[PDB]
Amino acid sequence: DKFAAKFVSHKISRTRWRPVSASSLQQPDVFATGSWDNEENKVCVWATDPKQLCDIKHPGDVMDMQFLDKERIVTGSSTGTVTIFRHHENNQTLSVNQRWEQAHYHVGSNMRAPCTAIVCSSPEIVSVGEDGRINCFRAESRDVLRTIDDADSSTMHGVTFLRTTEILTVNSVGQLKLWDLRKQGNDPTQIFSVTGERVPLHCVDRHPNQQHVVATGGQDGMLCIWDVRHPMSLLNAHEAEMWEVHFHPSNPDHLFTCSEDGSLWHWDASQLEITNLLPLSVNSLDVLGQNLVCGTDAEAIYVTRRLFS
Amino acid sequence: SNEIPEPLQLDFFDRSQIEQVIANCEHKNRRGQTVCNVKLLHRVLVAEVNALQGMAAIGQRPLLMEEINTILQYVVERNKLLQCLHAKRHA
Amino acid sequence: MFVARSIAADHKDLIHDVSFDFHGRRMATCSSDQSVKVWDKSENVNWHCTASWKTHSGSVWRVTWAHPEFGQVLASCSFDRTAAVWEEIVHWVKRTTLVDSRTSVTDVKFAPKHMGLMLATCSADGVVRIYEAPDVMNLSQWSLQHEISCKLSCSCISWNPSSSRAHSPMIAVGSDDSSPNIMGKVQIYEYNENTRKYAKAETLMSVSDPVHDIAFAPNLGRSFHILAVATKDVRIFTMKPLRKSGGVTKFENHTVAQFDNHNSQVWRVSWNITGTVLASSGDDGTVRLWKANYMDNWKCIGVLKGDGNPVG
Amino acid sequence: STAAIAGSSAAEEMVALLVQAGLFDTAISLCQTFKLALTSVFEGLACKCIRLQQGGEAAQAEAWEWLAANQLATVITTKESSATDEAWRLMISYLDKYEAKNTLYHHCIINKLLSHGVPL
């Protein structure tokens, strides 16, 4: 009943709301979606059935999408190119701002390498990739500020700004590496791994308040709670790979985990209360207060405005 | 008292799947005889690893054979313990 | 929606044969100007030429792509009794030049992956040679392992795509020789493990006319096999193996379809990925597609005009 | 038992027992030291190959095993090879390395192969 399902024609890989001003008591209404597994993929912007406002033909596949600010959307293509789009609200038109065509490319060989994940702290854009590379750019710089080459032989899947000038990266062999952007060396400060297992890690998230709490997800569908200072807790959850984990921004006591089996579970800390919000595969989710949106591989967008009712 | 030991540590097998073989052994020969026969069980176990093709890396065979022996011992122990419990219950 | 695309070939001379790869994105176009061009497909349907090189002085007949598991391996047979193996370095580089054949190598076919990298070449002398590369990293080394004499001028070869262990490797060999009286131009060779050699299993005596092309159909978990024979008329056969050893298991053959609708010589026969729709070419310039219904009745489902338009 | 027998014997006797047991590479080495010819070892290898050509499954597995006791030069991924073909390659390699008069080695191999007939 809560969820209103509008069927689109493109598999939805990413769903992210437009950051809302805290001072004003406004409710988030505009969110953005990115599509994959199609000949001509695209980036759409919707307003809460959701009505699409504007969309742009995105070259390649939209792997990861982050909202830099209210008017800028940073998208990572599957060809490695990291692009920034400027939203002109007055004319409802998305326009290309700045792009780094060869941000990620495999060593020596010809052809391209995919950009798995991006993270943003205006004006710093750190992008990891399948190749061992942690390229760092700036909103107005036409050049790459720093490139940690051969950082990880294995494909890196995700990235997040632990503290400042520090990034936590997960890789295909099950290793959480703490990196530092000030040290000029190309070696990780610390490497956290489960003893004996090499289960790949797909997702990583940091607690909004305390910076020492990091939650990650593996191919075994297990939620591992880590303490970067001191895995504290291993939680059995899904019976299949956990693609994305997200903490609720306003009230962190709530957590949402999406798996390919098709279950948008909700964890409530405030005895963890686990409930199935949805009745193919759920790829992404984004929550901001009482509003949540998730995109599935069944070419559908599920939007709720009364999540906690 | 009851003293059941460690589980199966399988190198190139599935610990969960060995339970079906455990139930095969747990078939009652006649009445209350959940012990199959050491002759049959041994033969079958020896033939299982032969079926597993030892191809390029054929240097693990001694280890494979020790594992067969350990499994047999554990099965025997289980059966003995079950029989003892049954006798205790009777008494 | 049948579409018509006009891709400028950029070829100075007549194109002979094109062949797709396993995953359907890379294709090789051999031409009469002694050049082999590799066209690759981008995210957009548009095709782009990536590599162009000269290969042999003799007329190149066929081009066969290997399974991607072994790498980007090509193969090209020619009039000058050679079978070259190509591989990129990261430009295509010739690794070997198989020249044991004393006559024009007419057809080259890669073995199914389960057996290994076993290139097979049939020559006009009547000898099918099955080579084998011991290590995939070194592709310059190819050792001949089996030579099968057929006593007739070979025109085409086709392996059995079946991966069932029960089905021993089988290869089919045709004969283009325009023999006035000699029949049985399609011979099937089976591999007897006991003798570790190839022996003749069945000869299709029904085919008494020159065989231009043969093609096995995927087994699809069935007891029998399907062989398409292109002669003056399209013929489909069913070889059911008999009951059951020390020798070849004899077969029982039945001709289940014979189409002379081409009214001309059928030159090429190829099945689709699932072996349901067979296509055929002819002197009329038309490609007729044949598909079976629920009652096992084969019927033509499409005809094409020369100018590219479909026949309505 | 052959252990005790080696305990009090000579070189020819050692070679004999090793070939019987199936430890061929050691027999090869011993032959070279005392300048004894390699005929015995080549013939023994041929015998095993003929046996496997037409043999039971257990024989095939034991064959795989004694190949590891010896030294297979390289690893080949071919599924169709099985133990028998691996033993063939071992013999072939041993021949190429430890070769002497050609007539002798080829002769003995071919002779033993035709114990009960074989298509070369």
GROMACS .gro file of N, CA and C in nm, chain A residues 216-281:
model
  198
  216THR      N    1   2.974  -0.325   0.630
  216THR     CA    2   3.003  -0.376   0.496
  216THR      C    3   2.920  -0.498   0.460
  217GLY      N    4   2.906  -0.523   0.330
  217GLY     CA    5   2.831  -0.638   0.284
  217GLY      C    6   2.904  -0.728   0.188
  218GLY      N    7   2.895  -0.859   0.209
  218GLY     CA    8   2.964  -0.953   0.123
  218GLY      C    9   2.877  -1.032   0.027
  219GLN      N   10   2.936  -1.130  -0.040
  219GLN     CA   11   2.860  -1.214  -0.132
  219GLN      C   12   2.780  -1.319  -0.057
  220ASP      N   13   2.809  -1.338   0.071
  220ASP     CA   14   2.736  -1.433   0.152
  220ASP      C   15   2.610  -1.371   0.213
  221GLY      N   16   2.582  -1.246   0.179
  221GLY     CA   17   2.466  -1.177   0.233
  221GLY      C   18   2.475  -1.157   0.382
  222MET      N   19   2.594  -1.122   0.431
  222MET     CA   20   2.613  -1.105   0.574
  222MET      C   21   2.654  -0.962   0.606
  223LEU      N   22   2.592  -0.905   0.709
  223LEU     CA   23   2.625  -0.770   0.750
  223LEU      C   24   2.733  -0.775   0.856
  224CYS      N   25   2.851  -0.723   0.823
  224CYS     CA   26   2.961  -0.723   0.918
  224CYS      C   27   2.983  -0.582   0.970
  225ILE      N   28   2.968  -0.563   1.101
  225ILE     CA   29   2.990  -0.432   1.161
  225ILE      C   30   3.134  -0.420   1.205
  226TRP      N   31   3.207  -0.324   1.150
  226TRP     CA   32   3.349  -0.309   1.181
  226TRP      C   33   3.381  -0.188   1.266
  227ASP      N   34   3.487  -0.197   1.345
  227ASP     CA   35   3.532  -0.082   1.422
  227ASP      C   36   3.672  -0.053   1.373
  228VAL      N   37   3.690   0.057   1.300
  228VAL     CA   38   3.822   0.085   1.241
  228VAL      C   39   3.932   0.106   1.345
  229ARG      N   40   3.895   0.145   1.466
  229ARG     CA   41   3.993   0.165   1.572
  229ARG      C   42   4.034   0.035   1.638
  230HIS      N   43   3.942  -0.061   1.649
  230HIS     CA   44   3.974  -0.183   1.724
  230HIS      C   45   3.992  -0.309   1.641
  231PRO      N   46   3.623  -0.764   1.285
  231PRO     CA   47   3.481  -0.728   1.278
  231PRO      C   48   3.411  -0.750   1.412
  232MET      N   49   3.353  -0.645   1.468
  232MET     CA   50   3.286  -0.655   1.597
  232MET      C   51   3.167  -0.749   1.592
  233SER      N   52   3.083  -0.735   1.490
  233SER     CA   53   2.963  -0.818   1.482
  233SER      C   54   2.938  -0.874   1.343
  234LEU      N   55   2.911  -1.003   1.334
  234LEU     CA   56   2.877  -1.064   1.206
  234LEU      C   57   2.731  -1.104   1.211
  235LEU      N   58   2.648  -1.042   1.127
  235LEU     CA   59   2.504  -1.068   1.133
  235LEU      C   60   2.452  -1.148   1.014
  236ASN      N   61   2.386  -1.260   1.042
  236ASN     CA   62   2.327  -1.341   0.935
  236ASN      C   63   2.200  -1.276   0.887
  237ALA      N   64   2.188  -1.256   0.757
  237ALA     CA   65   2.071  -1.188   0.703
  237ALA      C   66   2.015  -1.254   0.579
  238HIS      N   67   2.065  -1.215   0.462
  238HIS     CA   68   2.011  -1.267   0.338
  238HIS      C   69   2.075  -1.398   0.296
  239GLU      N   70   2.012  -1.467   0.202
  239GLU     CA   71   2.066  -1.593   0.152
  239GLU      C   72   2.133  -1.572   0.018
  240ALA      N   73   2.167  -1.447  -0.013
  240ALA     CA   74   2.226  -1.414  -0.142
  240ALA      C   75   2.308  -1.286  -0.133
  241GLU      N   76   2.381  -1.249  -0.238
  241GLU     CA   77   2.471  -1.132  -0.229
  241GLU      C   78   2.404  -0.998  -0.193
  242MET      N   79   2.461  -0.925  -0.098
  242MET     CA   80   2.406  -0.796  -0.058
  242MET      C   81   2.468  -0.685  -0.139
  243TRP      N   82   2.394  -0.632  -0.236
  243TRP     CA   83   2.450  -0.530  -0.324
  243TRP      C   84   2.476  -0.393  -0.260
  244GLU      N   85   2.386  -0.345  -0.175
  244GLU     CA   86   2.402  -0.212  -0.114
  244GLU      C   87   2.353  -0.200   0.030
  245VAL      N   88   2.428  -0.130   0.115
  245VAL     CA   89   2.384  -0.106   0.252
  245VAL      C   90   2.385   0.045   0.277
  246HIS      N   91   2.278   0.098   0.334
  246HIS     CA   92   2.270   0.242   0.359
  246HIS      C   93   2.216   0.276   0.495
  247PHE      N   94   2.286   0.364   0.566
  247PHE     CA   95   2.238   0.410   0.695
  247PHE      C   96   2.140   0.522   0.671
  248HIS      N   97   2.040   0.533   0.757
  248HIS     CA   98   1.945   0.642   0.745
  248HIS      C   99   2.014   0.769   0.790
  249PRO      N  100   2.019   0.871   0.704
  249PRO     CA  101   2.094   0.993   0.738
  249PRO      C  102   2.045   1.063   0.864
  250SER      N  103   1.917   1.097   0.872
  250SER     CA  104   1.865   1.171   0.987
  250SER      C  105   1.866   1.089   1.115
  251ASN      N  106   1.809   0.969   1.112
  251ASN     CA  107   1.809   0.882   1.229
  251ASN      C  108   1.888   0.757   1.196
  252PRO      N  109   2.016   0.753   1.234
  252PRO     CA  110   2.101   0.639   1.198
  252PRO      C  111   2.056   0.502   1.250
  253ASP      N  112   1.969   0.498   1.350
  253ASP     CA  113   1.926   0.371   1.408
  253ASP      C  114   1.855   0.282   1.307
  254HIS      N  115   1.824   0.336   1.189
  254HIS     CA  116   1.758   0.257   1.085
  254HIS      C  117   1.855   0.222   0.974
  255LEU      N  118   1.848   0.099   0.924
  255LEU     CA  119   1.937   0.054   0.818
  255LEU      C  120   1.860  -0.019   0.710
  256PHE      N  121   1.902  -0.003   0.585
  256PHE     CA  122   1.831  -0.067   0.474
  256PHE      C  123   1.926  -0.146   0.386
  257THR      N  124   1.901  -0.276   0.370
  257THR     CA  125   1.988  -0.361   0.291
  257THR      C  126   1.914  -0.423   0.174
  258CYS      N  127   1.966  -0.406   0.053
  258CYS     CA  128   1.901  -0.462  -0.066
  258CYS      C  129   1.979  -0.578  -0.126
  259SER      N  130   1.910  -0.687  -0.158
  259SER     CA  131   1.975  -0.803  -0.217
  259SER      C  132   1.912  -0.842  -0.349
  260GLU      N  133   1.980  -0.926  -0.427
  260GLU     CA  134   1.928  -0.964  -0.559
  260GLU      C  135   1.812  -1.063  -0.550
  261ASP      N  136   1.796  -1.129  -0.435
  261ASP     CA  137   1.681  -1.218  -0.418
  261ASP      C  138   1.551  -1.138  -0.424
  262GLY      N  139   1.559  -1.007  -0.404
  262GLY     CA  140   1.442  -0.922  -0.411
  262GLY      C  141   1.384  -0.887  -0.276
  263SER      N  142   1.469  -0.851  -0.181
  263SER     CA  143   1.421  -0.821  -0.046
  263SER      C  144   1.483  -0.694   0.011
  264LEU      N  145   1.403  -0.589   0.024
  264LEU     CA  146   1.452  -0.464   0.080
  264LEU      C  147   1.430  -0.465   0.229
  265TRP      N  148   1.510  -0.544   0.300
  265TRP     CA  149   1.494  -0.556   0.444
  265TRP      C  150   1.520  -0.426   0.518
  266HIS      N  151   1.455  -0.408   0.633
  266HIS     CA  152   1.480  -0.290   0.714
  266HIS      C  153   1.520  -0.329   0.855
  267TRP      N  154   1.632  -0.275   0.902
  267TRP     CA  155   1.680  -0.306   1.035
  267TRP      C  156   1.654  -0.189   1.127
  268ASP      N  157   1.586  -0.213   1.238
  268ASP     CA  158   1.559  -0.107   1.334
  268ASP      C  159   1.628  -0.134   1.467
  269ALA      N  160   1.722  -0.048   1.504
  269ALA     CA  161   1.792  -0.064   1.631
  269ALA      C  162   1.712  -0.006   1.746
  270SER      N  163   1.645   0.106   1.722
  270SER     CA  164   1.566   0.170   1.826
  270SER      C  165   1.441   0.090   1.859
  271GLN      N  166   1.728  -0.522   2.035
  271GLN     CA  167   1.663  -0.616   1.944
  271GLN      C  168   1.643  -0.554   1.807
  272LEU      N  169   1.714  -0.605   1.707
  272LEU     CA  170   1.699  -0.555   1.572
  272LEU      C  171   1.567  -0.602   1.514
  273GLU      N  172   1.485  -0.508   1.471
  273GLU     CA  173   1.357  -0.543   1.411
  273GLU      C  174   1.373  -0.549   1.261
  274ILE      N  175   1.361  -0.668   1.204
  274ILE     CA  176   1.380  -0.684   1.061
  274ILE      C  177   1.248  -0.709   0.990
  275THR      N  178   1.218  -0.627   0.890
  275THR     CA  179   1.093  -0.641   0.815
  275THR      C  180   1.116  -0.631   0.665
  276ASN      N  181   1.033  -0.699   0.586
  276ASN     CA  182   1.048  -0.695   0.442
  276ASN      C  183   0.957  -0.589   0.383
  277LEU      N  184   1.014  -0.481   0.333
  277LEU     CA  185   0.935  -0.372   0.278
  277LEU      C  186   0.871  -0.407   0.144
  278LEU      N  187   0.943  -0.481   0.060
  278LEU     CA  188   0.889  -0.520  -0.070
  278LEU      C  189   0.833  -0.661  -0.065
  279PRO      N  190   0.728  -0.689  -0.146
  279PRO     CA  191   0.669  -0.824  -0.151
  279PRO      C  192   0.767  -0.931  -0.198
  280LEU      N  193   1.260  -0.872  -0.972
  280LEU     CA  194   1.379  -0.945  -1.011
  280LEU      C  195   1.493  -0.921  -0.910
  281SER      N  196   1.569  -0.813  -0.926
  281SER     CA  197   1.675  -0.782  -0.829
  281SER      C  198   1.680  -0.634  -0.792
   0.00000   0.00000   0.00000
